[PDB]
Chain A
């Protein structure tokens, strides 16, 4: 040790040289230097202390303890921004997390689509673009415990492309009903099916299927008839792509049971012409289509 002015005058500020010289002329060279592990005084990193680091040293002008700037020499006047912001990259985002962004205007459909693609193989673009959301049954459901009545939000929604697929999903949440709709949207996209339609317009023939206590009587319709059916079925049809229908609900008229029954009826109660012809060994002809043919 005991460096000369070479490699020392050009590396340390000039004003700090006299102190270094006095330290060299005071501390005997070849003096043993204990390390104290009862008290911590030096930083855990090497530092010469020649430069006042922002965010790791007191800001000049800040009225702090150990502020040597008299009382009328404080040089901070605008208390509007955060003095001494973070150093380096300027943020402490931990690994594996993303900086929050617009969430109020970010559609929940995008969140559902991303999550489903994460777990299942479905693509997000189709869910976001070609699927329609419309709730069916929103209501507060209450269970009582030792604590007391516990209220839960039960939401049932349908999702379809107006081109053949429709799904039904129910979700419960105690935090809020928006969450219940989120779970229902999640489930319904998970539970999508394919509905056979006659000329992409109406069902094949008439259906008289029974769901638990709900008697679904549905009959086909003329072109341009419109959905002259119960509102639950009307919503299911409009989301599923059915445009002309007519029917009546008998016995129980519970909305949720109606929705489940009509989805099932579309799925399995009806049969396509091609399947009947193949299993029959016969030929079924649409007179309307062949009358207007070439």
Chain B
């Protein structure tokens, strides 16, 4: 799906799977059960 934009910029498509994924993460964000912030390696040693 990612390559469709390269070949056919004119027509817009929707990836129902990715949209469902982003909808679910946003719902969890609103509900408060979001993903914890991952800590970088630079932290501590």
Tell whether any CB of A sits under 8 Å from a CB of B in the complex: no
B contact residues vs A (CB 8 Å cutoff): none
